[PDB]
Design a protein around this ligand. Sequence first.
Ligand SMILES: O=C(O)[C@@H](O)C(O)[C@H](O)C(=O)O
Ligand SMILES: O=C(O)[C@@H](O)C(O)[C@H](O)C(=O)O
Ligand SMILES: O=C(O)[C@@H](O)C(O)[C@H](O)C(=O)O
Ligand SMILES: O=C(O)[C@@H](O)C(O)[C@H](O)C(=O)O
Ligand SMILES: [Cl-]
Ligand code: NA
Ligand SMILES: [Zn+2]
Ligand SMILES: [Zn+2]
Ligand SMILES: [Zn+2]
Ligand SMILES: [Zn+2]
Lengths: 413, 413, 413, 413
Amino acid sequence: SINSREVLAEKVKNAVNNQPVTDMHTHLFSPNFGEILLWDIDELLTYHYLVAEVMRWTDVSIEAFWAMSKREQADLIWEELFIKRSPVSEACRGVLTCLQGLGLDPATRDLQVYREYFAKKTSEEQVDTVLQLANVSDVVMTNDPFDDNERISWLEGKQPDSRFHAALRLDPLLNEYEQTKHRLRDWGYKVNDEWNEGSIQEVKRFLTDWIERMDPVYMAVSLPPTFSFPEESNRGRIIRDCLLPVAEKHNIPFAMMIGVKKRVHPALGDAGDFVGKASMDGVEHLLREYPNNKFLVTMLSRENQHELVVLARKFSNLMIFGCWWFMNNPEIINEMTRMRMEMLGTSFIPQHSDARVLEQLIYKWHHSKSIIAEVLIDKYDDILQAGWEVTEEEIKRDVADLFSRNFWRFVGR
Amino acid sequence: SINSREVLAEKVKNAVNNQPVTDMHTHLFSPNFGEILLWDIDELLTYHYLVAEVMRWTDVSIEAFWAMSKREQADLIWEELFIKRSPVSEACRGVLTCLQGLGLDPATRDLQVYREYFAKKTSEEQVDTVLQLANVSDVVMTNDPFDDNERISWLEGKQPDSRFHAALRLDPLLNEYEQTKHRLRDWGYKVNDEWNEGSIQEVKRFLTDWIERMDPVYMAVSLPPTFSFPEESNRGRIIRDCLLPVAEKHNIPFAMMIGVKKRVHPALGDAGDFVGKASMDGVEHLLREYPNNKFLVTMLSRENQHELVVLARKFSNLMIFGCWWFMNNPEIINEMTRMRMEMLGTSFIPQHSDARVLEQLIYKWHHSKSIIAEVLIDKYDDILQAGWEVTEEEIKRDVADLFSRNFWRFVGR
Amino acid sequence: SINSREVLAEKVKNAVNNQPVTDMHTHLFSPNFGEILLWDIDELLTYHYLVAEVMRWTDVSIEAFWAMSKREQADLIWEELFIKRSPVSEACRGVLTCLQGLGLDPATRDLQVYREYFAKKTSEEQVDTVLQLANVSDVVMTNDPFDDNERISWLEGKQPDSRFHAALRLDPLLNEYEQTKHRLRDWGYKVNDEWNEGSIQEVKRFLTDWIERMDPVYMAVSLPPTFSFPEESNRGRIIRDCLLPVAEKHNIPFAMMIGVKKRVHPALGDAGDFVGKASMDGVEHLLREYPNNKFLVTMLSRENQHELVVLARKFSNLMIFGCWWFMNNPEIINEMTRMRMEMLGTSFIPQHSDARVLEQLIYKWHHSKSIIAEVLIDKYDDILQAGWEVTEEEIKRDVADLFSRNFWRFVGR
Amino acid sequence: SINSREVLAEKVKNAVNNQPVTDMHTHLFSPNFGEILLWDIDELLTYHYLVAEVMRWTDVSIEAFWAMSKREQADLIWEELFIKRSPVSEACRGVLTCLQGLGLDPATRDLQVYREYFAKKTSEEQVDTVLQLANVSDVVMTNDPFDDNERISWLEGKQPDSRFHAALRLDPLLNEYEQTKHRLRDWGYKVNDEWNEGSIQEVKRFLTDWIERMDPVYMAVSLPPTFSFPEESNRGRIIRDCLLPVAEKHNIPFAMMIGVKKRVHPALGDAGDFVGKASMDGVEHLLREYPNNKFLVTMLSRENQHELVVLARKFSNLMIFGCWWFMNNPEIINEMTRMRMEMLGTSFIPQHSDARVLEQLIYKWHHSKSIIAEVLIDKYDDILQAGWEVTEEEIKRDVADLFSRNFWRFVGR
Ligand SMILES: O=C(O)[C@@H](O)C(O)[C@H](O)C(=O)O
Ligand SMILES: O=C(O)[C@@H](O)C(O)[C@H](O)C(=O)O
Ligand SMILES: O=C(O)[C@@H](O)C(O)[C@H](O)C(=O)O
Ligand SMILES: O=C(O)[C@@H](O)C(O)[C@H](O)C(=O)O
Ligand SMILES: [Cl-]
Ligand code: NA
Ligand SMILES: [Zn+2]
Ligand SMILES: [Zn+2]
Ligand SMILES: [Zn+2]
Ligand SMILES: [Zn+2]
């Protein structure tokens, strides 16, 4: 038996640390796709999360910033966020966790020496190194066929190795149909200006074609805080008449990341998005009215978190996942994971990395695993006190479900 | 006087665990009322909180589940939530706490043996046992005159034990007046199709009649997130012209449990209710415009909790109570109780059990007391460090107010 | 070298304790303004925060309360909140902390003796004593030219000493222009009936004249949950045509304190204000459309805190500050500071005292600094463990930024 | 590098735990030697250290105790020292650590179940199991040619396996020559009544004969607190004319375990020995006057420990080792190890187990490694603080010296 919390803590920490992770949502790509897979210290430092932060300190105008080279940008952020002020924020701390994990020494602050480490490795080598360090066995990518560069790679035979899984990202189709319908036509999908049977079948064809070419684990889309459903709009009709039925047929879950308010600050680029609390009505309707469809949902507002958990108690076809973007900070990750486990036990997916830069897998999982471990230790200790006798194998089992099995079990694969 | 956190913690925990509890809201009934009072391990396992949870895991269809016998359902839940996955959720932990409390040993996981304990015992007995273990001196029931079985009971003179108190629940009357008014007719209450003096006075008779028959400590109603007041609706009118004036006459408080969205998932039965954030406008209005009325309030949305505390700072005729339903989880209980004590001192009612099954009193109060004691220890220790000295007597006094006195003083009994 | 959390806790606690504080928002006044500057134990006990709290207990009518003398009220509150029940609330705790900090001993509960301390001392002496004990180097006041007593003081030549700075509060002008315009004309400002060039120019003259006279660090206003911008109202036009242009010319930041619902309980006086969640739309617009203007923002609703931080991530012309009013409680201060640091690093102002009574400076900063120090320890420890070198000089630098430099840096002074 | 004490601690603990141990003094025997190798829970419970302790509580006479069967003695000790009083003593704590280490569960206190674990294993199997758990690579036995049983095993040609090493124990020869000389004669060693050339040569012959048969890593003897040298006694002459000369020729060190006063309480058997402070004169003389001889020393009196460390500072032919018997308690092990490291760096052997029962290897080493690890963390931290940069490889090296290499390097094998 586990006679003390101290022994329980060590055992839980070991289980969590040893458990290979399936990162069900990232912005990483199989290395064979080429330069689109971003990596190295300069990429880590230029992560848009750090761009927003540096802009709060530097005198360098945003225009000037974008005009600088990748190396110059990295130098500026290093100086502004690490040298001039202690790198205490979550994103800055993450850069340090990566460096340390790669065997580099943050104590020297020798940026040139860190760069040299990367300059002598191939992408294939760095992916092997990182996946081993972060103990990540499977990476789910975000594949947007509407992006010209991504589309051409797929059309020209590019396929990911077994460690990388595809996910059909449909933001342009679902949120900008008025513009996107023209491109569908240019690609041979005869969508009409009237939402008729022809338009429905062609949008379905598009989805089916890409499902066949990508073999996605799920279809996804990020939605605004004003998201509602049903709705007489292109989004409402495409979801209802095309997406859901196609998803039901192939038994592919629909991933909705709700709460992002796009481009409140255009100049910042990828760092210019904001957040807003959403109504749960649209989500509630979808789960109740489409019982044969699977939905993976993560929300951006802190104020949506608790009710999202309650909604998960209502419908089994709802699998909530991760602590997304602005929620991906220790204070939030902790409260979210606790409310989730208290109302759902182990029937959820606590985290994903959303890694845009390869090395981030190291800090994203290291930082989150330590928090999730502390939650588990409290929960296990609580039942041990109630007289329950939890075993190490059961612990390893629960941990496997949280970090990998629940996802694969849900996507039905 | 106490001059160390060590001794302080000793005395606080002692006062808290020794303090006789008055559960000012439950779904239990004096044992003389018969079977309506649920109890035993099978009832604990089939609590709807656990029904919602098992459905997220089990392959069994909700139809087949409802088709199963009580025993069969319990066995399914025990297997799905306790054996196949660690029973870490608050609801599952609660069952274990209950068993351990009764002397049973969760370490064995011998569901059969646990079952035998209850068999060889009677309702009258188990109530004495449970009330002894949970150290609860008074239990406030939820008495719905609109329920047939329950109604006939009060009609036949059935009086509840002196340790069980009555609460007049009016959900059907205030939320479904249109369908309810017809039943009011059948009971000699001549309500008119229109809201005239005739209808107003008959609704009052209905209320006054039951107040006499039940001698309730308060009248209660659960409301939706969209609750508004004033409001040109039956609820708005019935509350304004009947409930309020009557309540003020008998000097009886009005308990409003706001935030529940009923039947979002009909098939789940009692486990099918959801939650939503409410506007404080209505409660603000009621408290201000009706100073001679006493209001007991509790809300279901995590996002309503802080402003409710602030509202309690504004109006003394407002007494906030407990961490209701989806709020009844350690993470929320802790933050709620701390915000409350920081802005209200000891002028609020920290908790109620909402027990639907007798034994639940054990875990409900055990889990809550441990959290409440911790909060008290920190707050006492903070003033202790400022030089203030607290006596054990003052501690028992304070603990008395929180777990029993504030309620009786508020209702005026 | 700082090579452990233990050593770090020491250095951080020391740094925070020794860092002189610039309180960028208070209701204190330079001693040479006389009466208006409140102080002593009777004033502390009658802080409106404690009034609201006593009214939740004392059966003394609010009318009677206001009818009695300062000392009578102080005696009642002390009796009701310190003797009748342990003074565990934040506001009561504060009273005790101020006493101890002054040398008085709360263990004795000798109110009479505490009073003798203040009786034999001048105002000039008490400010010197308090500013020293609270380690506060600069105090920003709230100067409302619409208050007859304050306005006449400025008009007659009253100037604050080196330690007190002015802040031009404009609530009457922006939120009550209909009644206020009549007073502007009485003072020579020819604002017309319709919002035309003449009205715009005179309102500007009004602001400019007062900017010359007070030389304020910033212009301020408290706003309701329903605040919006742009908006066709006097507030919206005054801000758009008058406030912003003037603020930009003199490079004076605009301080918006959003979320207060005034007078939901008029009888309580200053203690009768409530809170409500606001939309971020207005703030988002102001920041994006007026890049040459600087904004200081703090919000009253707990539910606005997280999204306000994200907004700060989008705009560098936004500087968020403090845990205002109902947010100024440990539980909230803690969660707010951690969310801010995690997403903003050190680019924010964690706190302000909002002191109405001089002595409060002692407890406001002592209670807050302890929480902020603990947050810092956690954040520094996280990067230390990640391999980062943290020097005592860098800690002092960061601490100095948070408690003083960020403010002066933002205001351009 | 090692940036923090927390990381240093993890690395030191790991190095220490992972380092295979050479236990240079035990009372264990290679399994092929027979039943002389004691093992199992009953042997653990009847360890003489526990016999002395039980006699302080039990009403059972020492005579009756010796009359009981081994199983009965074990039952009594378990009841008296573990059940009737908490097993907080070091020797009792040790029994528990062994049980836990073997996978058994101390929480059940099921002595019968623990016994079942041992009945199904063979000596050779338990040796493999224990050496693995305790991470002991090499064991030094105590081989007494004067014990009939053991002597026969050697005369038969039995050899210990590669994991076990011999040490020629000479207590009978050196301390009881008058009686022992008669046995030397029966064995062919023609020693005379007078200490002449013949006696000296036969004694030497006896030593050489056994050194050739055992190939001991050292010759050893336990001495009384009155030990002196030079000395005109059989011990002084045998050491001067036989032991030392032989030891030099074979380059074999002489181990002296000084401070034991034998049989102060005869009836207690092996548990009847006491302790006394010794003069350092004889050891000082031996070290200085016999520079070509190597000496391994350990002393029993707490009051001899510091001066022994200082003596090691004077002579390189002196190797001090372990915390012997009455010194083998946490409080002493810690103060000893700290004085030794502070005055000798890593030039000493911190510990040996003195295990009489096989399983004790588990607790002796587990208990000592944790203390030693703590001392090392402190010392490394102090030099890290002085700017030194210790590497993980240097730590492993230092650890190997302390737990293994220093010994083998000193005995030149
Ligand atoms: O980096 C991010 O998290 C965002 O910029 C987006 O990639 C977001 O995660 C999304 O998937 O839409
Ligand atoms: O179990 C519960 O708490 C709910 O299902 C209801 O009983 C709720 O508490 C209510 O009283 O409306
Ligand atoms: O005491 C308070 O904080 C309030 O009553 C107001 O002074 C508020 O701080 C404001 O500045 O409007
Ligand atoms: O168990 C013991 O440590 C003693 O009884 C002796 O074995 C002593 O260690 C010795 O070697 O003489
Ligand atoms: Cl909200
Ligand atoms: Na919290
Ligand atoms: Zn993403
Ligand atoms: Zn209820
Ligand atoms: Zn203020
Ligand atoms: Zn020995």
